[PDB]
Every structure is written in structure tokens, then in C-alpha cells.
Write a protein that binds this ligand. Structure first.
Ligand SMILES: *Cc1c(COP(=O)(O)O)cnc(C)c1O
Ligand SMILES: *Cc1c(COP(=O)(O)O)cnc(C)c1O
Ligand SMILES: Nc1ccc(CCC(=O)O)cc1
Lengths: 394, 388
């Protein structure tokens, strides 16, 4: 029977990794990595995180089945981290998920249950994994302009015009901050306008928040999400603790369904809990507990924010250096966008040929869409990247 | 939009838990003499070791770690593990394995039907309904003798066809406790072999029946006869790591070509559902299984648990016998696993729970591990006084 199986395409990421590994060049650089890495090219376990696991290992007396929708301590702590004082629990439904991806998958299954004729709008471009899930689910996908290939900024007029076409009940997916892969983000003013458009159209906003704390700061990064949450009655948020907590493999995420009234919140929470049980029963406990421990424990929380800020500030400094070097070598401020982008990613705006020229001639690897991970750069590699970009004619 | 969400049916087994001289004999978790579900010695040691050796939490394997995959396959199939024709996927618990098992099967056969035992784990049907998969049932439990209605079972299974899937409980049948013998398994294998129906084996209690190896003997028989087999295994109970959410799906194929296909479709299945599988539980399991010292202690403790439970079944059966002279309750000591169905009518069941405080599942499924020397006669009285 299983021979009827249609061959599924590999992750590609691996192929990219293999491409790098075969290269016999000593000065080969890898900017294609999708996770954070410190100065020694390592993805460390955060101090607060290691402390939490140490504490859990000493406090846990059992591992019996726990909450189906996650633990209250975690739901509460997360909604507060994301929504701040604007958290109205009376109308907020929370579901612990298997990472941010799990949260996204669950948000799409929920919406389809509420509206079978659901149509989803995604930015151009967006996290490929978004389209993967949607295509797999067989949902009609529609695109809205977003990245301006010329300025490397946000084509806001195009985005607004495109979103205007959204009908009542349709879903529009927005990255709360640190747009992956572009690194180009909306200003709070641009968010305000988007909201007015969503009110007018009556489309349900699904916010993918996977990098809170990597752009301008924890609070600052949640600003857009918090504006949408106060203007629009129904909002779906997919939060990830993978990167901002550095617990990638633990698979900890969170789905928040903001509702118009309490009756609808019970309807949503029930359907969410139901969705978890029909997929894998209970959600992963470990990473979630680490997170609730860090946020509730004063000492730990403080140390976590402090470490995240050191990471954030460092990446920002790398951005300024690259932009500076690029300025000096270019004799123009053409590449200034690198210093404006937020998140650990940036799309350079180089065509596939230029991307291939950079690799062949300079030994620098990056995603085929010219996306680079700022965290893969340093005082020794920035000069090379600066030269490569210039020499290839970007 | 969300106001259109219809209300859904809840997990009655877990609902009971919430509703809870209180005596809980519901949810399928192991309990010690003091009503606690401890963490196993090896597990605790494994975690301490992990906290000390892990230097990163970056993304890992989409199908799980090689260590976990190999260890699990050896645990389940013993020396019958043919890696060249075996695909393995790490999942979110045994339940996630079942869901993935159905997804994979449905991909390869959009017109598949699933045959389930009467009765069977409620979650089996809910998931199939959710997906919209047609469910057929085969006679399994014998209402009177409390054993297996083997002749009815073979009869119904004979009606399966190429493409159909038959779900079997590898050992310790939930919720009855009635189990097939090896001789019965060999007969089931011949039926399946002639019908071409793909068997899905739910292995959630390996080690709670007769022993680690004996509980996998049936699964190993089917595997050595049927070229294509699917096994959804759970580490929740036998490792006592319920909340960690760890299990795996094994796709046994007839050749390497299909193996690569299955492995690819399985990995894709995780990618489209939640990307990577949880790491913490799978790590504990592999560490225990690959560390001779830890493994030995785990088996020792699992052995202790298994023996104790049998002690209880015997003690309970005895109390009932010496409380009526009615040998009709002997099936209790004959059933193998953590559960056993008293056979009491639904009204009898709800009767005792609201006053005696003994909360058992509606179909009179009792978690034997909930009992103990001082709670046994109280349960025995109830049964006797209410009949059945
Ligand atoms: C990383 C990421 C996620 C979440 O990944 P998980 O590892 O599943 O938490 C979701 N969306 C985007 C855009 C991401 O970059
Ligand atoms: C326990 C059990 C499972 C698996 O539960 P998980 O917590 O998801 O591992 C699956 N099937 C049956 C019959 C079970 O008893
Ligand atoms: N969804 C779920 C429910 C219950 C259990 C525990 C086993 C049982 O009670 O049958 C596991 C999973």
C-alpha cells in the first residue's frame, strides 16, 4: 500500500547545509543559518533557561498527564508577556502548542472550523512554511505586496491596495515584528492604518509573533500586536518561545484567540482544547514549564530580559558596522537599509545569479533569495561580505 | 467569525478526572501505594545527566534523533528490526503517532477503511471521525466470559480488503484487559496475510502485561509475517513520562524504495503539523535505553510495577470470591494490563460513584493500579451489593 506514496521534497535546508560542507575552502562563510549564534558560532542555552531546568529537576515530583490546553501558569504568563496590561482574560482563549508552527497550524484549523470558505492572505514574501501548511490543508492562498525589491523597504501603498480586496471572514497573516525573511517592518503608524483596513473589510488578522525581543525590545516589538488587539475584536496570535527563549528543540508555542465576548471565548477554548486532543492529546510540558518558571520567578525573569537585550543590541551593532563598511566601500548610503532592518534576517535584494556569484567567487553562502542571518557576521567576516556585495554589483 | 464555533464532545475519561472516601479508578496512569505517580529512578538520573551534558537547544531532527529511533525500534522489534526496510518518526506521544499513522495511510489510500475492536480506546474513534475516516468494528470482547470472542473476531476480519487497515492492541487491551494469545496472533496473521489489510498496532503498555519482551511477541509475529506494518508506540506509561509527550511511529516496508518514500512522507507530515517533535522526552528514553546501567534499573522498576499490579488482581479476585463464593469474577486475575471491565451496567456504574466515591469509567473500566490492600474490600463490597 505505502508504495502508492508520492515522494515528498526534502527540507532543502539540509541540502544547503551539505552544499556548505563539501566546500574545501577555508574562508567559507555560512549566512544561511536560521538560528542565533554567538561570537564562537554556537547557539548557547540561556542562563535563565539553564537555571529553570535546574530548578524543575529539583521540584518536580511527578510527570502524570497535566493540562490539555497547557498549564494556567504558562497561558497567563504568555498572554501577559505579549499583551501586557491590555490582557482581558475574560475574552482571551489560550492554547499551548508544539512550537510556533504548531500554533499556526492550530490557528488555521480553528478558523476553517469557524468558516469553511476561509481564504488566507500572505505577505510577499513570507516564511515558506506558511504556504507549505496552507497548501497541505488545501486552503486558498492569496498574496499581498510587501517587500519593495528596489528600496528593500515596505511597499505600503501596494500592501494597502492589496489588502483592500479582502472580504469579511478572510484571514490576513501579519508578522508582528522582525519580518522573516526580509527584515523590513511596519511603523506603528502603518499598523494603525492596517487596522482601519481590517476593520473596514472585516477580515480576521492572524499575527505570527516569533521574534518578540529581537527587534527594538520586548515591549516595543509587541506594540503592533497590541494595537491590533485593541482595535479589532477578533484576533488570532501565534507566539513562539523558540528563539527569544532559545529553546528551539523543546517545541514551545502558544495560540491566543482574542474574542468579542466571554460566550465566544468558551466556544473557542473548547474547540482549541479539542483540536489538541485530536492531534496529539496533551501538549509538550518541558519547554513550557521552563518559560512559565522564568517569567514568574523575579530573579530569572530579570536575567532573561538582560540576556535577550545583550543579544538584540549585539545584532544591531553588527547591522551598523555592515552598513558603515558598505557605505565606505560604496561611496553612497544605498545600503543604509541594513541598519534600518530589524530581526536577525535581511533580504539583500540580490538576484539568484548574484547570490551564486557571491558563493563561487567569495565562498559566502546564503539563502537563494539573498536572505542573510546577521548573527552569522562578525568583525572578521563583515569586511568580506561588504566586498562581495559590491564586487558582484548588487 | 469565531462565534460560529460549534460546541464539541469532551474526553469523558478526562472529564471524570475533573469531576473527581474518594477512590479514583479512572484515567490510565500508574499509581503507587500512596496514590502517587512517581518519576522512575532511571528517568530522574537521565534528566540529571542531560542537564549536565547538553550545551545547545538548536533545532534537531524532524523525524527525531537517530538514537531515539534505533533504540525504540530495537525495543519494539528486538532482533527482527530490518533498518533497510524500516522508517521511524518521532511523535508527540502515542496519540500523535496514531494520528500520523492515519494521515500517512490516508495519503497512500484515500479510500481506506479502519477496523477497530469492540470495544476499544475511545480516542481511536474520535480521531478517525475528526478526519472523516469510515470505521468498521470487529467483535473482540465477549460480554459473558469477559474474555475474547475469537471466532467472531476472525469472522469480521475476514471481511477486510486490500487497502483497509485493522487496528490491533499489541498487548494489554484498553479498556477490557482481555488479550490475544500467541496462537491467536498467528491465526490473525494468516487472515491479514490473505486479505492484504494493513495492520496498525497500538503499543502503549509494553511491559505492563507479562514482561517487556513477552508483550512485544505478538507485534513481532505480525511483523515477521506481514511485509507492511505500522506500529504506533507510546513511552508515556512504561517510562512514566506522560506529560513529556513522547512516542514514535514505525513504518515497516517490503523494500528499501518504499522505506525512503514512507520516511519522506512521515517527515513531511511532522513539518506540516508542528515542524520538529519535542526533544526532552525522546532524549530521556534513548539515554535510559543506551546506558546499560540505567536500562537495567528501569527494567527492574518496571518489573516491580508489573508484579505488584498482578498481586492486586489476584488479591481483588480473591476478595470477591470469598465474598459470594461466586467464581464468576475470576476473569479479573486473568486479564492482563492496567485495566479491567467489571461488566456492570451503566446504571450500576453511576450508582456507586455518586455515593461510594469510587469513580470508574462509565463502562465499568477500573484502573487496577488504583486499588490497594485497604481499598480492595471496599470496592469488592460495592460490586457484590450491586451485583453483576
Ligand atoms: C521560527 C518561526 C516560527 C516558529 O517556529 P517554531 O520553531 O515552530 O516555534 C514561526 N514563524 C516564523 C516566521 C518563524 O521565523
Ligand atoms: C496511553 C495510550 C496511548 C498513548 O497516549 P499518549 O499520552 O499520547 O502517549 C495510546 N493508545 C492507548 C490505548 C493508550 O492507552
Ligand atoms: N487522550 C488520552 C486520554 C487518556 C489517556 C490515558 C489512558 C486512558 O485513560 O485510557 C491517554 C491519552
Amino acid at each position: 500500500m505505502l508504495g502508492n506514496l508520492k515522494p515528498q521534497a526534502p527540507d532543502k535546508i539540509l541540502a544547503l547545509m551539505g552544499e556548505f560542507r563539501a566546500d574545501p575552502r577555508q574562508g567559507k562563510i555560512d549566512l544561511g543559518v536560521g538560528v542565533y549564534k554567538d561570537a564562537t558560532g554556537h547557539t548557547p542555552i540561556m542562563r535563565a533557561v539553564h537555571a529553570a531546568e535546574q530548578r524543575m529537576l529539583e521540584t518536580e515530583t511527578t510527570k502524570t498527564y497535566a493540562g490539555l490546553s497547557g498549564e494556567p501558569e504558562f497561558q497567563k504568563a504568555m498572554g501577559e508577556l505579549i499583551l501586557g496590561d491590555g490582557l482581558k482574560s475574560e475574552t482571551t482563549a489560550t492554547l499551548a502548542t508544539v512550537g510556533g508552527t504548531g500554533a499556526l497550524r492550530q490557528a488555521l484549523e480553528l478558523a476553517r472550523m469557524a468558516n469553511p470558505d476561509l481564504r488566507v492572505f500572505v505577505s510577499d514574501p513570507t516564511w515558506p512554511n506558511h504556504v507549505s501548511i496552507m497548501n497541505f490543508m488545501g486552503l486558498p492562498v492569496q498574496t499581498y505586496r510587501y517587500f519593495d525589491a528596489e528600496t528593500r523597504g515596505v511597499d505600503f501603498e501596494g500592501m494597502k491596495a492589496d489588502l483592500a480586496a479582502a472580504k469579511k471572514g478572510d484571514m490576513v497573516l501579519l508578522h508582528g515584528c522582525c519580518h522573516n525573511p526580509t527584515g523590513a517592518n511596519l511603523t506603528l503608524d502603518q499598523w494603525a492604518e492596517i487596522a482601519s483596513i481590517l476593520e473596514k473589510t472585516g477580515a480576521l488578522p492572524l499575527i505570527d509573533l516569533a521574534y518578540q525581543g529581537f527587534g527594538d525590545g520586548l515591549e516595543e516589538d509587541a506594540a503592533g500586536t497590541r494595537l491590533i488587539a485593541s482595535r479589532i475584536p477578533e484576533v488570532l496570535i501565534a507566539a513562539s518561545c523558540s528563539k527569544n527563549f532559545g529553546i528551539y528543540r523543546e517545541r514551545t508555542g502558544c495560540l491566543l484567540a482574542l474574542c468579542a465576548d466571554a460566550a465566544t471565548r468558551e466556544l473557542a477554548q473548547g474547540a482549541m482544547a479539542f483540536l489538541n486532543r485530536q492531534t496529539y492529546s496533551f501538549p509538550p510540558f518541558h519547554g513550557a514549564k521552563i518559560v512559565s518558571t522564568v517569567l514568574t520567578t523575579p530573579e530569572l525573569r530579570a536575567d532573561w530580559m538582560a540576556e535577550l537585550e545583550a543579544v538584540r543590541s549585539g545584532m544591531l551593532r553588527l547591522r551598523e558596522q555592515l552598513a558603515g563598511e558598505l557605505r565606505d566601500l560604496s561611496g553612497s548610503d544605498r545600503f543604509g537599509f541594513v541598519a534600518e532592518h530589524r530581526g536577525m534576517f535581511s533580504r539583500l535584494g540580490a538576484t539568484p545569479e548574484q547570490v551564486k556569484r557571491i558563493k563561487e567567487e567569495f565562498g559566502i553562502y546564503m539563502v537563494g533569495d539573498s536572505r542573510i542571518n546577521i548573527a552569522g557576521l562578525n568583525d572578521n567576516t563583515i569586511p568580506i561580505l561588504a566586498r562581495a556585495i559590491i564586487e558582484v554589483g548588487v
